[PDB]
Structure formats: structure tokens, C-alpha cells
Amino acid sequence: TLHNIITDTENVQGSFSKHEFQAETKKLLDIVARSLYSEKEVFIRELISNGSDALEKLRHRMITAGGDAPMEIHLQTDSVKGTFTIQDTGVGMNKEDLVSNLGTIARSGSKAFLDALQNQAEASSSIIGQFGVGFYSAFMVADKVEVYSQSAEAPGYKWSSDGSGVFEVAEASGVRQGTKIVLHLKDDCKEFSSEDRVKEVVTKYSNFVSFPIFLNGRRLNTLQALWMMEPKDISEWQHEEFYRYVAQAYDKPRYTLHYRADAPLNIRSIFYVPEMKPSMFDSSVALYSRKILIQTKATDILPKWLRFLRGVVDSEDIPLNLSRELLQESALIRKLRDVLQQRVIRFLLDQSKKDPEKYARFFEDYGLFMREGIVTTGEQSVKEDIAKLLRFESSALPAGQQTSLMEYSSRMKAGTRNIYYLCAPNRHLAEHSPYFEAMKQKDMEVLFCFEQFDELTLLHLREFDRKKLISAERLSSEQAEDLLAWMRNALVQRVTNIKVTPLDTHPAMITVLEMGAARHFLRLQPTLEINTGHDLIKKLHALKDSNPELAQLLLEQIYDNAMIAAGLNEDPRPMISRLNQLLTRALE
Amino acid sequence: TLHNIITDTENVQGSFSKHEFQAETKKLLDIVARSLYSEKEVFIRELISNGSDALEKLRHRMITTAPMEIHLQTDSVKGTFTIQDTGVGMNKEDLVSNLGTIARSGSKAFLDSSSIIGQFGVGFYSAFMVADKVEVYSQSAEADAPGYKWSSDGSGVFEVAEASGVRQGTKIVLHLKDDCKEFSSEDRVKEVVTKYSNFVSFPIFLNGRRLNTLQALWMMEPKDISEWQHEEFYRYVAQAYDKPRYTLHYRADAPLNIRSIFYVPEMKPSMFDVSRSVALYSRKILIQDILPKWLRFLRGVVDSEDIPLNLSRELLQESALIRKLRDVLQQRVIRFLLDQSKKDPEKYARFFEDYGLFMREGIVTTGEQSVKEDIAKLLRFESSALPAGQQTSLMEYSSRMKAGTRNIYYLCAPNRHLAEHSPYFEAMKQKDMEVLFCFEQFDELTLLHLREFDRKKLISAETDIVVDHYKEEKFQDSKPASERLSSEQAEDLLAWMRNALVQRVTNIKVTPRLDTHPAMITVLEMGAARHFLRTILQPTLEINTGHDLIKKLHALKDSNPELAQLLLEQIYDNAMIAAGLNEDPRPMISRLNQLLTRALE
Ligand SMILES: Nc1ncnc2c1ncn2[C@@H]1O[C@H](COP(=O)(O)OP(=O)(O)NP(=O)(O)O)[C@@H](O)[C@H]1O
Ligand SMILES: Nc1ncnc2c1ncn2[C@@H]1O[C@H](COP(=O)(O)OP(=O)(O)NP(=O)(O)O)[C@@H](O)[C@H]1O
Ligand SMILES: [Co+2]
Ligand SMILES: [Co+2]
Ligand SMILES: [Co+2]
Ligand SMILES: [Co+2]
Ligand SMILES: [Mg+2]
Numbered sequence A: 001t002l003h004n005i006i007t008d009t010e011n012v013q014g015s016f017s018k019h020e021f022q023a024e025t026k027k028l029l030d031i032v033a034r035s036l037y038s039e040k041e042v043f044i045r046e047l048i049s050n051g052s053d054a055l056e057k058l059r060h061r062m063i064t065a066g067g068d069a070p071m072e073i074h075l076q077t078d079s080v081k082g083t084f085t086i087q088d089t090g091v092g093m094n095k096e097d098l099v100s101n102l103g104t105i106a107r108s109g110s111k112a113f114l115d116a117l118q119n120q121a122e123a124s125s126s127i128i129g130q131f132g133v134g135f136y137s138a139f140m141v142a143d144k145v146e147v148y149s150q151s152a153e154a155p156g157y158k159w160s161s162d163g164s165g166v167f168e169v170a171e172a173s174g175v176r177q178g179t180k181i182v183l184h185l186k187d188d189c190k191e192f193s194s195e196d197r198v199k200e201v202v203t204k205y206s207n208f209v210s211f212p213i214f215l216n217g218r219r220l221n222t223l224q225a226l227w228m229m230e231p232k233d234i235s236e237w238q239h240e241e242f243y244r245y246v247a248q249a250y251d252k253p254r255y256t257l258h259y260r261a262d263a264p265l266n267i268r269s270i271f272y273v274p275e276m277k278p279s280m281f282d283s284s285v286a287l288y289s290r291k292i293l294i295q296t297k298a299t300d301i302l303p304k305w306l307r308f309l310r311g312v313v314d315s316e317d318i319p320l321n322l323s324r325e326l327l328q329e330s331a332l333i334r335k336l337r338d339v340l341q342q343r344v345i346r347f348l349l350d351q352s353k354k355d356p357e358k359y360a361r362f363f364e365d366y367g368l369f370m371r372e373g374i375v376t377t378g379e380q381s382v383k384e385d386i387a388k389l390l391r392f393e394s395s396a397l398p399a400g401q402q403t404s405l406m407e408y409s410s411r412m413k414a415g416t417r418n419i420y421y422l423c424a425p426n427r428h429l430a431e432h433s434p435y436f437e438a439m440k441q442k443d444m445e446v447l448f449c450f451e452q453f454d455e456l457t458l459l460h461l462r463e464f465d466r467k468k469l470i471s472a473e474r475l476s477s478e479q480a481e482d483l484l485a486w487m488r489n490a491l492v493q494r495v496t497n498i499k500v501t502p503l504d505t506h507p508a509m510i511t512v513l514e515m516g517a518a519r520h521f522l523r524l525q526p527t528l529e530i531n532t533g534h535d536l537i538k539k540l541h542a543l544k545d546s547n548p549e550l551a552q553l554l555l556e557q558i559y560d561n562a563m564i565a566a567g568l569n570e571d572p573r574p575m576i577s578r579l580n581q582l583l584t585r586a587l588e
Numbered sequence B: 001t002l003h004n005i006i007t008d009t010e011n012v013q014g015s016f017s018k019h020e021f022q023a024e025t026k027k028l029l030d031i032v033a034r035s036l037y038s039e040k041e042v043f044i045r046e047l048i049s050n051g052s053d054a055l056e057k058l059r060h061r062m063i064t065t066a067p068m069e070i071h072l073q074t075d076s077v078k079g080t081f082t083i084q085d086t087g088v089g090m091n092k093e094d095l096v097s098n099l100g101t102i103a104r105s106g107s108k109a110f111l112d113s114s115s116i117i118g119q120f121g122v123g124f125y126s127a128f129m130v131a132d133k134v135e136v137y138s139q140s141a142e143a144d145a146p147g148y149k150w151s152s153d154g155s156g157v158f159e160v161a162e163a164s165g166v167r168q169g170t171k172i173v174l175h176l177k178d179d180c181k182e183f184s185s186e187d188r189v190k191e192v193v194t195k196y197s198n199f200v201s202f203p204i205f206l207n208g209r210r211l212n213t214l215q216a217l218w219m220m221e222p223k224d225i226s227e228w229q230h231e232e233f234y235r236y237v238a239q240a241y242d243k244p245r246y247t248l249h250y251r252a253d254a255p256l257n258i259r260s261i262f263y264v265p266e267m268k269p270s271m272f273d274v275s276r277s278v279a280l281y282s283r284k285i286l287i288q289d290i291l292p293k294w295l296r297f298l299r300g301v302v303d304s305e306d307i308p309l310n311l312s313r314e315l316l317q318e319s320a321l322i323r324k325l326r327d328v329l330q331q332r333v334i335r336f337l338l339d340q341s342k343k344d345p346e347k348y349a350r351f352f353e354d355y356g357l358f359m360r361e362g363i364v365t366t367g368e369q370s371v372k373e374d375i376a377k378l379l380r381f382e383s384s385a386l387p388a389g390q391q392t393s394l395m396e397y398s399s400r401m402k403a404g405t406r407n408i409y410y411l412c413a414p415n416r417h418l419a420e421h422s423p424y425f426e427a428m429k430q431k432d433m434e435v436l437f438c439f440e441q442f443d444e445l446t447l448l449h450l451r452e453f454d455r456k457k458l459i460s461a462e463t464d465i466v467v468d469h470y471k472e473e474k475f476q477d478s479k480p481a482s483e484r485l486s487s488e489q490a491e492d493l494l495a496w497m498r499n500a501l502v503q504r505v506t507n508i509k510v511t512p513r514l515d516t517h518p519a520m521i522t523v524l525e526m527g528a529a530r531h532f533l534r535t536i537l538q539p540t541l542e543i544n545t546g547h548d549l550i551k552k553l554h555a556l557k558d559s560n561p562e563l564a565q566l567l568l569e570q571i572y573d574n575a576m577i578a579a580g581l582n583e584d585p586r587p588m589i590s591r592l593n594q595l596l597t598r599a600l601e
């Protein structure tokens, strides 16, 4: 029932030829200029990266062979002629370098320059170019490209091409030191001769480029890359400002984490938690490399549950896809994500100590993210890492006070290893749980979990600290029996039981067996319990025969009042008209 | 004030030299091997695509019998991945010029149909992502013609020799590097095929077993798809176990080529997943928004030939075409859902109940008014002019509006009975306008954001009641003056209430607009106040001096003054709750029980 035709039936017969791999130059240029980037606008990123690199090499040269000029990138638009022009005052290119570097695809002068530096040299970490293709991005948007270049050594040149397999080189006066590139834009790309549009692209990708960038004689990039600076030389106001820019936000960060490290990758990063809680009516952490935008929404570097963080991650040696808008599959990027997960958890844990009050607000607003993380990850070790961030209330603690799974594990009786919880809409329904009343008597402490999805979190948690979480789950004696028998008939299809109990000020209360049910209800088999010493109950007893119609309203009210006190009816609008009838008739 | 450096100053001196662009081949190979594809597994897709193309070329040549299939083999002991197709094969010139030359694609000069996948001339080199060594055995058809072995380590050179025992077609053997042993696992290779190549037009066999490849339903004639084929296909694309309640199979050629199928699940959406969905294809191979956020409940697939692919085959290439496509799809889906409401309103009611929250979200988070209104066409309400239970729409409301009218009135209450008997509705009934009844939690927020519809302002009943004070209060009471407090009694009572409720209310007023209710709370921007409470104000308390409870209060203030104050506090609380402006109701229960006992003697 198997069908395979793969068989070792081949044998080397005779002699063989040796060939070198070739490359169809014509088609390859078309591929860069058409089939490489998701957006045409990206040619501006590339040309500015080149200007930065040229400037960086000049700066490097002058450390040793010092000499004389300012280091700048200038952009000019001409909306009448349809041109885009960029000029840098960097190292420039002689005729040999124009032909070699521009004329040859995947040849990178910058890459060779990098490979020859001491790894410690500043330029080692700021040179952007790697592949030797970014320049061809100009043909995506231009029918004609002209390059004027003057090297810093001992004649100016003009390089020229339409990008169709050929190019021309001639001597030129009077070219300024560095390189000037003029793009004659295609008709469908004339938008890049608009100043406003070019400004949008520069700020998107290249806002943190190290050298001043001018557009039509005006400076743009006034924003310094805070993530590359020493964490201590940065003030709270700089973070507030930088946060707003990077998160496109208008509030401040409640938390700031400035993380720098060298392994598995170079990392310079800043993470923020917004002060404003998120909701339905609605950026992410951005990825950079050597100060250039890679992805506005970084995908592989953080786990999904940490998507509430804003900010930036920059790595010098993260493996980039050729398009420079994706990362390659890498064991190093996987390790980075794991490292960051642990760092952020560690940071939030520290914060729960420094200010439990503040952390309490944070957990109310963002705790859902932690719960999601515990449910969706498949690593038990990490589930218990994220679980250190959870807060609940406890049977063994007062109302409104939070504790962690660790603090519970702390207080446990020495001879036991079970974590008991009870997921309830509220505390009243918890304290009066049949299942919890059990754990009151013989057993001891139970976690009260009121938040949404607290349940399946713990179900998915399964195991914490090698331990197991498991859900713990007046009126005479015949005047009352008469009253009860009456009550069961007026509330036939509302409750599945009516009891009598020792309540004080409250004439009745609602209790529920399954908390699980009550959630379906709020999305039920209540048990009303009557205080036969309460005046309204004794009044109810008297009116059931004397004024049956009045006692019907009163009964309904006592039931509704009990459901409200149990948090089982949060919006009492349905009762108001009846209640008003009860009041008018009572007040005759 | 300006700093520029760019000046038209440069002039050419003497003649030019002419040059041809060149390529650094060795470094291109490295780029294809390490930097081109973001995921290693796609070498499987690329090799299958080549096999599929070779088979298409043979099919086209066989017109003008033999099997046409693709075989995969994993050897986890030898660390080897093998693929063999029964296609046209390659001759010596072909092995050299097409395989040996990066960016050379024989699958171009073949033209000359739309079944051919290969375009760039680089896909084959993806093998070097995962393999130290690659051997190729190919046999052309017919044509003369010898067999050949092609061989390379991936760096720089390769060798070809004539060979025997080469079956018609092409076999390729990947000697996997230690980094990539996962591709000698059958379960692993199977995962990849079904991910990218599950709609390939020829059978694929893995280690002798035929893979369950599928029909590209979206490309096919809609009328030839049975409900059951859609059920199955839905379950596949949505990875679900239930079936679709709606199926939209959309083809178009203008303005954009589009072949798509969308499904709405029969299941209600998980509330967990809502806070925490359509695949994109080209030529039957997977490609990795397209729908606006509010339509993320839809499942299914979109294919469009106007979307260009990047070199790596994982990104789309015109962020403006996409916005267009998305706008087209949004429009088509709204029209589809409007049509479903016509055909079967009862079934649509269930849909709206389960998914309505997505519409409301869409209305609230869009900035474009015409889009808010388009989505708003999907909303359903009840009406004061229709029997209980009968759903209607903004459009139908608009069509009943008299010539003079210029506003759409609405009232938000938990249910039909509460709206019909709302004090706000009693007040509105004195006018002759139709009032929409909206029962869902975020309906008010939604209409607040919607603001207007078809040039008609949306106004809540509660708001309209306040505005009428600043016009003519030309309304007469429901009860004759005999059944009301005299003015002197009304003024006396009000002055008392103002003292008893000093810092809780802005003012207190009688109103002729109530019947069943003793009082109501009014706030100009009621809706916005309700929304704000979900985490005081300048509320007005308006009393009905014809109501038994109000008149009794007038008496009580002079007979049991303490009881009168307790009554007063409760009336205010009742009006706040009825207004939807109440804080936690639990702490009022104490007062209420106390009030209840003192009343009952
Ligand atoms: N503005 C410039 N000034 C001086 N030299 C330049 C300039 N632009 C490009 N070059 C040179 O031309 C080469 C080719 O540029 P490019 O095609 O962008 O490849 P790359 O910058 O080297 N690497 P990549 O950007 O990752 O593809 C560079 O490496 C430099 O040697
Ligand atoms: N299995 C095969 N059988 C026959 N010819 C093949 C086979 N694989 C590759 N070829 C030939 O070799 C050429 C190069 O393949 P490839 O590098 O994948 O580029 P491409 O398929 O043409 N376009 P693309 O896949 O989009 O990069 C193809 O165009 C075919 O002419
Ligand atoms: Co052999
Ligand atoms: Co070195
Ligand atoms: Co000139
Ligand atoms: Co009309
Ligand atoms: Mg470059």
C-alpha cells in the first residue's frame, strides 16, 4: 500500500566538467529594484544609511590621519523637475571605488572596511551596510540616477545610469568632498519630490541617525537615541519625552526598564509600561539595529503576553534579512526572547517589593496579560515564573488585601503540600461557599480568586513550586415553617431552596453552591436563607395572610435586596417601579 | 536661517567611459543561503514549486500519459532529504545555465499557463540554507538525450557528469547539515508541505504515502461548491471543529483581481480570545491587515494577483493596494451581511447577538464618518413604533421620518419592558417622534461615537428632555390639577427637598412630563455621564407632583419628618438607579431595609 519511486539506480558514468556559479546581472538588478522591499519609500533609508557610513568612515580616518569640514547629510526635493537629491560630506569615492562599489552587486566597500577594524573601534558598531545591494534601491523609484563624488585623497567624478545593465563615468568639476546623488523620479513615484512626504520617511526609519540630517535647508533629526546612553545620565523627564515619541503616546510611563547587555547579543533597550490602562477603543516595542528602524512592531523578540510593553530594542549583531525589515531564524534571537522574558519578570517582581501599592495598581490594569501568558505558554518552568506576578485574596487574610502564591506557600502548615483556591465573583459568595466552609473547619487557608479568567489560569497553571493547586470545589419554630412554605410558592421558579439561619441586620442572604455557576449567571440555583428574628421577616409573616398583596411586594423586595447584597444583581433597574409601588402602598 | 549645501554646480569634463554592472557571485550565494529567507523550512516549498513547474511544462508538452507526481523521502539515519518529480527534466545546457546561474529562470523563456510558480530564478539555492551537499539527477524529454548528475558543495563551483539509471524527471538529494536535522524527520517535513504546499496541483508522496493535498476552493466556481465542501474547507482553514453559519465566496476582477472565501463560525466567539485570521495566497502557495480589525471574527482565505511578492515570498509589496483591498473587502462584507439580514432576519438576529460587539468596536475605532455609518447599517434595535421583539434598523427608522424631522431619537435600557415604561419614554411620548430602543451594554457608547446617520443627528431621549427646558416647556401634566399639589404646596415641598439634598443635586424641579414615576434624574450629557461611571455631576431631580408617593412625601415632611427624609433619600436613589447613574447599590440596602421597617409600622 506504499508507493515510492525514489531508488538508488544512478551511477556516475564517464568524466565530468567543472563550472563556476554565475549570476545574470540584468535580472538581479530588477530583483533588487522590484522584489526586495515591501515599500518603495525604503530607498531613502538606504541612501541615508550610505551617507551615514561614508561620514563614519571619514570620522574614523581623521582619528589617525587627522585633517580638516562638517559631517552632514542633506536632502533636497524639486517638485517641478521631480527629483530627489541627497548629499553627504563623508569620505567620497574615486573612479576605482565608483566602478567597484556601485557597479558590482553584493560588493560592499563598507563591509570590507568593517572587517579590517579592531572590534573595539567605535565605527565597528555604527557602520550600517552589510550586503552590497542597498544602493540599487534607487532604481525602484528612479528612471535615472546620477552620482557626483569627490574623494578625500589627491579629481571629481560623475557616475550615471538608467539601471538597465549599463552605466557611465566621467570626470567632473566642481564636486564637493563627499557624494551627491540625484534621482530623476518615475511618474508613479513623484511623491518623493514632496517635502512633507520625504520628511515622513526620514522620521520613520532614520530619525536617530548619528549625523545631522537637513531637508531643503532645515534640520529634522533632533532626537537622540536614548537607548544607547548610560542609564544614569538619563533623567525622568527625558524618559517621559522619549516614551511619548516611541509609543506615540500622551501620558507618562509608570515603569521604566533600561536594559543593556552583550550576550547572546549586543542589547541596548528601553521598555516602558504606560500609565494609561488599555481597552477596546484602540504601537508596540520597536526593533532597531545600529540606530535604524527594522520593525515598528517587533515580532520575535518578546513573548506575546509582554505586548503591553512599549519602547525599543536595538541590537548591533542581530541577523538581518536582506530586506532589512525582518530577522532571520536564529537560536540567538530565540535565546534573546527567553532572556528578555526573565529580565522583565525580574523587574516587575522587584517593583512589587519597592512599592506593593503601585504594583497593586499595575496588576489590576495589566494582570490579564500575565494570566494570558500562563495559559498560552507550554513551558511549566516559565508558567511558574510569570505566576510569581499573580495576586489574589485569601481565606486566611482580610478582605481587599493581596498575596502571592509564594506567600501562601510560605504560611502553609509544615506537613502539607497543596494549594487551595476558590474562584468566586466576590468575597460574600466565597465566605459563604459550602465547599469553603469545609476548608474552614478541618483544613485551613484558601486563595480567593475574584478576577476574570483566574480559574482557567490556575487550571492551566496546574503546578506551582512543585506543588498542586486544587479548587476547594422572635419567630417560633412553626410560625417560620408556615412562612417558609408560603415563600417557596411565590418564588417557585427563582430559587431551588429556602432555609433558615443565624444574619443579624440582614433579613435574608443569598448563597450559592457552585461559584462556576454564578459566573454563568453574571455572564443558577440560589439558596435564600431567612433571619426569623428580623422585623421585616416577622412583618412578612404577618402580612402573608392579612395583606397578601402587600407581602408579595415585600417578599420580592427582600429577595432582590439579598441578590444585590451578594453582588448577584449589580444593576437593579428592573425592580424600581415595583419598589416604588411597595413604598406607596406601605405609606398609606 | 537656512542651511543648505546642495547647489547645481557640477559640470562634466571630457568624455565618459562605459561599463556593465557586475555581480559578486560568491557573496550572492551566501546571501541566498543565510539572509534571503527568514525561515529555513521554505527550501521545501521552493523545491516542491520547481517540481510542480516541471510537471506543468510536461503536461503542456504532453498534448502535444506518464505519471505526474512529486516524491519526498526522509532518511533520519543518513541525514538526508530527497525530492523527485516526474517532470520535464533538464539537459546539460539546462543544468548549467538554469541551475548554475543565479537569477536565471528557465521558467520564463517557457512563456511562451498561470500555474507556473517560478519567477525570480533563485528558489533552488534555498537548498544551501540546509545542506552541505546537493546532488541533482535529471533526464530531459525526450529529447536525444542523456542522464546527468549535477553536484555542488554550495561554494563557488559545481560539476556535471553523464549518468545512467536516471528516471525521466529530476531527483534532488540534500545532505543536511547538523544544524538542520529536523528535515530528515517525517513529521517535520509533513508539517511544512501542508503549510505551504497543501494546494499543489500534483500528488505529493512522503516516504511512499500520499499526502492529503486539497483543492483551492477559492479559485473555483462558487455555484459548484456544495455546503458540505464549505463545511470541510472552513474546518481546515479555521482549524475548527464546528461549521460556518455564513459563507461568502467573493470573486472580482475590477478594481482588483480577488478570489476569496470568508466564513463566520457557528460557535459564539470566545471572550478570552476576543481580548487576546484569514490566510493569504498566490498560485496555490501560502504567503504571509488584509481585513480591518473589526472583521477579525471572519475566517477564510484571500488570493489576489495584483499583490506583488517579494523575493523571499513572505511579504506583500504595495501598502496602498492593501489598504484598497481591505476597503473593498470591508464594503463587500457589509453588503453580504446586509443581504443575510434581508433573506433571514431571525438567523441574522442570532448573528448580531453573537458578533454585534465587533460592529460596535468598528464604529467606535474608525475615524471615517462614512465608514462608521456603513458599519452602522448592520446594527439592530427595537422601536416604540413597532411591536415588542421586532428588530429594525437606522435605515428603516430614517424611512419613517416625516418630512420636517431632522433627528433620530434613541433610548438605552436593559430590556423592552424597561424602555417602554421608562420615565424618559413617558416624557418622549408627549411628542410624536419614533424612539429606537437599544438593549445592549455598549449601544450608547456606540451611538455616541456614531453621532449622526444619513445627515440626521442622534439624540438620546434623556438629552432631549433636558434641551426642552431651554425651549418652550409646552407640556401638560398627565393628571388634572385636582390630583396635583397646589403651587404653594409644590414650592413648599421643593424648598424642603433642596435643604435635605444640599450637595447631592444641582437643582430640583417639578415636571409635567411624568406619569407612572414619582421622579427622575436628568443630565444634559447623560450618555457621556453613564460612560464615565464605568471606571460627581450636575444632576437635576425632577418630581411628579401628581404621584401618590410625592404627595405623601409632602405630608410626611410635617408628620414624620425623619421618615420623610428617609423616603426622600430613597426616591433620589431610585431615580439615580433608574438613570443608570448609580454607584454600588449594596450600601443603600441598609437604608432601604430601615426605611421599609419604619414604613410597615
Ligand atoms: N554616499 C556614499 N558615499 C561613499 N561611498 C558610498 C556611498 N554610497 C555607497 N557607497 C559605497 O558603495 C558601496 C555599495 O553601497 P550599498 O549598495 O548600499 O551596499 P552596502 O552599503 O555596502 N551594504 P547594504 O546597504 O547592507 O546593502 C558601499 O559599501 C560604499 O563602499
Ligand atoms: N525539478 C526541476 N525540474 C526541471 N527544471 C528545474 C527543476 N528545478 C529547477 N529547474 C530549472 O532551474 C531553474 C531555476 O530554478 P529556481 O532557482 O527555483 O528559479 P525559478 O524557479 O525559475 N524562479 P523562483 O523559484 O521564483 O526563484 C528553473 O527556472 C527551471 O528552469
Ligand atoms: Co551507488
Ligand atoms: Co577584526
Ligand atoms: Co547641470
Ligand atoms: Co419619507
Ligand atoms: Mg548601504
Ligand SMILES: [Mg+2]
Pocket (backbone or CB within 6 Å): B046, B049, B050, B118, B119, B122, B123, B124
Ligand atoms: Mg523555483
